[PDB]
DNA sequence: TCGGATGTATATATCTGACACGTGCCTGGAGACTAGGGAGTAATCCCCTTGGCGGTTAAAACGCGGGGGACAGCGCGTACGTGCGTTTAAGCGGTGCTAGAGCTGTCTACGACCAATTGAGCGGCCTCGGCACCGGGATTCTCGA
DNA sequence: TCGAGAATCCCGGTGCCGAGGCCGCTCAATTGGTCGTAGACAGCTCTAGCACCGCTTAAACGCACGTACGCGCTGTCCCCCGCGTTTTAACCGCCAAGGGGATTACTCCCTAGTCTCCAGGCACGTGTCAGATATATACATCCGA
């Protein structure tokens, strides 16, 4: 699999930038944002899979994601 | 058919004390449950490190009080200390 | 004869369950007598403050039921609650309405 | 014939998307992205649905906060348009790179 | 008669103070500052000496890191001179104000 | 009072160690405000640990515990 | 006559005389190394305790310590720390 | 500055499905009562904090001249918005299957616990060399001719 | 383009205090044996995760067109840098008093533990009203002549 970083399209980054409060956007922000998102998701997925392997399972539950994010320094209410 | 304990009915009672004519959905109740567990674990861990620093083996109300003063900001900390002291006084006088 | 401790201390949160969770979760070797009473009083006060701020926003948007948007607005408009819940993401909450002034015409 | 002056639809989309609370990314492409970049850690994993919803909530919140700090950097440089060196300055002052 | 062009002594003082490891604040005025702004919390405290040395180490390290991030903001605005709005931008992106 | 004892050449030396070429003239008042806020937030927690331990002397371990609560972790003093 | 103070000075001195046979160490650097050993001990021990609480166990085994090292150290440093620990346990049993 | 024209609150109706209420049961909290060990209280003692004096000199404070950088205005071209018609794949519902998460029942191997030695590790005390300081001469980068 | 000259840098000589090693004595780690229970393993169940298929339409895509914004260029003035002179308080060494920080000893009352009993809270099953989704429409804001 080579795609699916292209699946984050370019009205979606625009909508995230306008919820952020941005009026006028360049044309390199798109690839820069895709790189940022891929790095963040890799760091979270790695710790979630570590908790899942230690629990001796094969499914990634919601609590493993919550515990991974809590280790990152980013608490998340509403899924526990 | 297995039990799972939460704080739903108690949050519902406090809501019916402050606003007697409103309700709460399930997602907001889940958020309030997470908030109560978060603050509980934070205060309890701080009290435990106080008891370990002072070479003692007992978590008491004075450790809980100093953990509250270290954890919460100013006016919120003063009102929390007042509420906890009033509850401990009414518990010992009604022994 | 069986009265609860919560009715003795005049509270709404349980005191027996807070004492069980202190004795069970490896915090210290002994746990005193006024510790769960003090901690249940503190947790009740914080819960009452959050819900008092949330119900007013549910009135202001003309609703009779609290949602995570109302919890988000109640937390982020207050000052000291925004310092307590500083790095915390509330699910399905959104942001506050902020626009910078040099962007306006 | 009728056209708005450029900036007007941008401002009212800012108001429209700061008023609502929803997911701003399509969720089948995001699910494919999660499964692909999880495939390089353990073969044949099996996600739930609330796990993917939690990951999408967390990712959306992270990107919105990064764009707010990027906008403040671009205003500090006496511009309006956001450029990628603003993103680099924000992520290096914050303590990420 | 002999004078250096302005900037030269600044650059060699940068090299000279990045080479050494010492305290860059006088310590009797810092001790008086600590005792004064501790007097409004508890009357008649009694500090040790290593407590004041630890506070001086921590304060010096904090100010040096703040000046590095301030310098990056001022370079981003295409200047050389550091102004206080650079300090404000650094402390607001970082998460302190 | 004593915040003026953090003089003009001392802030300049800290800026030179930070790597700063040229400095304006309002940085001094801005920097005195920043340093005062930092020291208030640390000395408050150090005095709270001292009051809980039933002492009248502020030791170095109290400063280390307060700085560790802030998220800063000084090595070298106990 | 004073009250004893347990430390890690003599063990750091043993490791230094294995790795650099003609090198000394001052007092402040030994204090920094003592603080470093205490810090890393408390991080790994706290994370292993939290794993054992998440999975509803009452025992800290070496598998929790391995998972805590893997969560807490970055990259190749974790790759070598796992090897050193496994090798020491294997030499301890036989 | 009025005129038109999009775009947004505002009112009214109708359905659906989640929140609020009611029941049974069952397990976790309350009530007495006993053992013993952590903690409170007094006394001692001696260290380390605080206050004061006096001579030295290094650093802070104050002018002063001038040059280099901040800041404001102007021109240009180009990169990014707004809107239109075409395509594509996301969302919704429905069906089917099966791996795997979850709970029960037996049992054994492993960690807590206790008593007796004994050697490792901490405090204390010499003691010599590594580093700190002073001085002199070589080098080298900067700036006005 | 080169000479003056003002700061770094390398080498040698003196000295002094702090790492480093040796010694004695307590107290914590080791060794051996015993007990009970936490967790490993085997087995059955039943529930969500995965895969596929057809339809509808909302949204992504590519394209013209025009304009507002980024960015370079210029001038001027003002404010910060480098340097020399005067003042001042930090730093070092010294003496002296006494508060309070550790430490030990001696009770005592507060918490863990056990066992019995019972009532509050959790899972499941109804039911109806709060809010989501239509249509019709005042009315507010933007751009142009």
Angle between helices B26-53 and B61-71 (to 10 degrees): 110
Helix (H, G, I), strand (E, B) or coil at B19: coil
State the Cα–Cα distance between residues D13 and D20, nearest whole angstrom: 11
Tokens read off for A69: 């994010």
Chains that touch F (3 or more CB pairs under 8 A): B, E, G
D8 touches strand I (CB under 7 A): yes
**d(CA C96, nearest CA chain G) in Å:** 35
Q: How many CB atoms lie within 10 A of CB C69?
A: 21
Name the class of domain B1-95. Answer: mainly alpha
The C-alpha atoms of residue F73 and residue G43 are separated, in whole angstroms, by: 13
Which residue shows structure tokens 């297995």? B2
Q: Tell me the C-alpha distance between F6 and F38, whole Å.
A: 14
Please state, in angstroms and rounded to a whole number, the distance separating the CA atoms of residues G61 and G80.
Answer: 20
Q: Of chain C residues 23-82, which have a beta carbon within 7 Å of strand I?
A: 23, 30-33, 63-65
3-state SS assignment for residue F73 = coil
| Residue bearing tokens 């494919």 | D32
Q: Which of A53, A68, A41, A59 is nearest to D45 (CA)?
A: A59
Question: CA-to-CA distance for E16 and D94, rounded, in angstroms?
Answer: 29
Name the 3-class secondary structure at G61.
Answer: coil
Look up residue A49 and give its two tokens: 């899979």
Q: How far apart are CA F50 and CA G33, in angstroms?
A: 27
CA distances from F28 to E11, E55, E97, F12 (A): 21, 20, 19, 9
Inter-residue long-range contacts of D34-38, CB under 8 Å, 24+ positions, other chains counted: D34/A41, D34/A45, D36/A1, D36/A4, D37/A38, D37/A41, D37/A42, D37/A45, D38/A45, D38/A49, D38/A60
- For residue F56, the domain's CATH number is 1.10.20.10
Choosing among 1.10.10.10, 1.20.120.1750, 1.10.20.10, 1.10.3080.10, the CATH entry for E1-97 is: 1.10.20.10
- Placement of tokens 């607001």 in the chain: E92
**Of C18, C25, C23, which Cα lies nearest the Cα of C4?**
C18
State the distance between the two ends of chain F, measured CA to CA, in whole angstroms: 33
Asked if G71 lies within 8 A of A47 by C-beta distance, the reply is: yes
User: Domain spans of chain D?
Assistant: 1-97
Give the CA angle between residues D46, D49, D54 to the nearest 5°: 110
Tokens of E84: 């206080």
Q: Which of residues 73-92 of D touch strand I (CB under 7 A)?
A: 79-81, 83
Residues D54, D57, D60, D66, Cα dihedral to 10°: -90
Cβ(B69)–Cβ(C30) under 8 Å? no
CA distance C39 to F32: 39
Of the CA atoms within 13 Å of residue D92, those in its CB half-sphere come to 14
Burial B35-71 (b: 16+ CB within 10 A, else e): bbebbbeebbebbbbbbeeeeeeebbbbbbbbbbbbb
Token pair of A3 as six digits = 């795609």
Give the HSE-up count for residue B49: Cα atoms under 13 Å, Cβ half-sphere.
16
Residues A25-61 as b or e (16 or more Cβ within 10 Å = b): beeebbebbbebbeebbeebbbbbbbbbebbeeeebb
Q: Which of C8, C83, C72, C88 is nearest to C41 (CA)?
A: C8
Can you say whether residue C53 is alpha, beta or left, with left for phi > 0 and alpha for psi between -120 and 50 degrees?
A: alpha
Number of neighbours of residue C81 by Cβ within 10 angstroms: 18
Residues in chain D: 97
Per the CB < 8 A criterion, the answer to whether C48 and B17 are in contact is: yes
Q: What is the spatial distance, in angstroms and rounded to an integer, between the CA atom of G69 and the C1' atom of H110?
A: 25
Domain spanning G1-94: CATH 3.40.640.10: no
Query: Can you tell me the distance from the alpha carbon of F42 to that of F63, in angstroms, rounded to the nearest whole number?
Result: 8
Which C-chain residues 69-98 have CB contacts (< 8 A) with chain D? 69, 89, 91-98
| Those residues with Cβ within 8 angstroms of residue D83's Cβ, 6 or more apart along the chain or in another chain | A26, A28, A29, D74
How far apart are the C-alpha atoms of D90 and B6, rounded to whole Å?
40
Decide if G53 contacts G70 (C-beta within 8 A).
Answer: no
Place of tokens 């009135």: C59
Closest CA to G50 of G73, G71, G30: G71
Q: Are C38 and B87 in contact (CB under 8 A)?
A: yes
Whole-angstrom Cα distance, residue D34 to residue A47?
14
Domain of residue A69: give its range: 1-80
DSSP F30-52: HHHHHHHHHHHHHHHHHHHHHHH
Q: Which two tokens stand for residue A55?
A: 């629990």
- Does residue F52 approach strand I to less than 7 Å at its CB? no
Looking at the partner chain, which of G54, G64, G67 has a beta carbon nearest the beta carbon of A50?
A: G67
Q: How far is E76 from chain F (nearest CA, A)?
A: 14
Which one, of G46, A68, E25, E7, lies nearest residue D58 by Cα? A68
Give the C-alpha separation, C4 to E83, whole Å: 63
Q: φ, ψ for residue E45 (rounded to 5)? A: -90, 170
Q: Please give the tally of structural domains in chain C.
A: 1
Task: Write out chain A residues lying below 8 Å of D39, CB-based.
Answer: 1
Say which experimental method was used.
Answer: cryo-EM
Read off the DSSP letter of residue E4. Answer: P
How far apart CA D10 and CA D30 sit, in angstroms, is 26
Pull the structure tokens for residue D30. Answer: 């995001």
CB neighbours of residue D89 within 10 Å: 23
In what helix (H) or strand (E) does residue B86 lie, and over which residues does it extend?
helix B74-92
Domain count, chain A: 1
**E23 vs A18, E27, F41, F51, F60, CA distance in Å?**
47, 9, 22, 30, 18
Burial of D75: CB neighbours in 10 Å, binned 0-12, 13-18, 19+? middle
Which tokens go with E70?
């301030």
- Nearest CA to D25 among A7, C88, C89? A7
Q: Give dist(CA E85, CA E74) in Å, integer.
A: 9
Distance CA B78, CA B66 (A): 12
Ramachandran quadrant class, D47 (left: phi over 0; alpha: psi -120 to 50; beta: rest):
beta
Q: What are phi and psi of E47, to 5 degrees?
A: -75, 155
Phi, psi of A77 (to 5 degrees): -95, 140
**Residue D21 DSSP symbol:** -
Range of the domain at C95: 1-105
| Residues C38/B63, Cβ–Cβ less than 8 Å | no
E and A in touch (3+ CB pairs within 8 angstroms)? no
Those residues with Cβ within 8 angstroms of residue E43's Cβ, 6 or more apart along the chain or in another chain: none
Q: DSSP secondary structure string, A29-66?
A: HHHHHHHHHHHHHHHHHHHHHHHHHHTT-SEE-HHHHH
| C-alpha to C-alpha distance for D53 and A62, rounded to whole angstroms | 9
Place of tokens 């998340």: A76
């Amino acid at each position: 699999l080579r795609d699916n970083i292209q699946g984050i399209t370019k009205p979606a980054i625009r909508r995230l930038a306008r919820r952020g409060g941005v009026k006028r956007i360049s044309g390199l922000i798109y690839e820069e944002t895709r790189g940022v998102l891929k790095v963040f998701l890799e760091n979270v997925i790695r710790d979630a899979v570590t908790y899942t392997e230690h629990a001796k399972r094969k499914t990634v539950t919601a609590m493993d994601v919550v515990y991974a994010l809590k280790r990152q320094g980013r608490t998340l209410y509403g899924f526990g | 058919k297995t039990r799972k304990e939460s704080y739903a009915i108690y949050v519902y009672k406090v809501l019916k004390q402050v606003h007697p004519d409103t309700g709460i959905s399930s997602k907001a109740m889940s958020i309030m449950n997470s908030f109560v567990n978060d603050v509980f674990e934070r205060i309890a861990g701080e009290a435990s490190r106080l008891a370990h620093y002072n070479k003692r083996s007992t978590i008491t109300s004075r450790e809980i009080q100093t953990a509250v003063r270290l954890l919460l900001p100013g006016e919120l900390a003063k009102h929390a200390v007042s509420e906890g002291t009033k509850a401990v006084t009414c518990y010992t006088s009604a022994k | 004869k069986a009265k609860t401790r919560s009715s003795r201390a005049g509270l709404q949160f349980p005191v027996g369950r807070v004492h069980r969770l202190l004795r069970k979760g490896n915090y210290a070797e002994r746990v005193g007598a006024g510790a769960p009473v003090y901690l249940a009083a503190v947790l009740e006060y914080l819960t009452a403050e959050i819900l008092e701020l949330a119900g007013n926003a549910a009135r202001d948007n003309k609703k009779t039921r609290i949602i995570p948007r109302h919890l988000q607005l109640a937390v982020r408009n207050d000052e000291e609650l925004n310092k307590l819940l500083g790095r915390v993401t509330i699910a399905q909450g959104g942001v506050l309405p902020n626009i910078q002034s040099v962007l306006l015409p | 014939p009728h056209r708005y002056r450029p900036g007007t639809v941008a401002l009212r989309e800012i108001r429209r998307y700061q008023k609502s609370t929803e997911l701003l990314i399509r969720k089948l492409p995001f699910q494919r992205l999660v499964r692909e970049i999880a495939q390089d850690f353990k073969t044949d994993l099996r996600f739930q649905s609330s796990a993917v919803m939690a990951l999408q909530e967390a990712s959306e919140a992270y990107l919105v906060a990064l764009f707010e700090d990027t906008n403040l950097c671009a205003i500090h440089a006496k511009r309006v348009t956001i450029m990628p060196k603003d993103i680099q300055l924000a992520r290096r002052i914050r303590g990420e790179r």
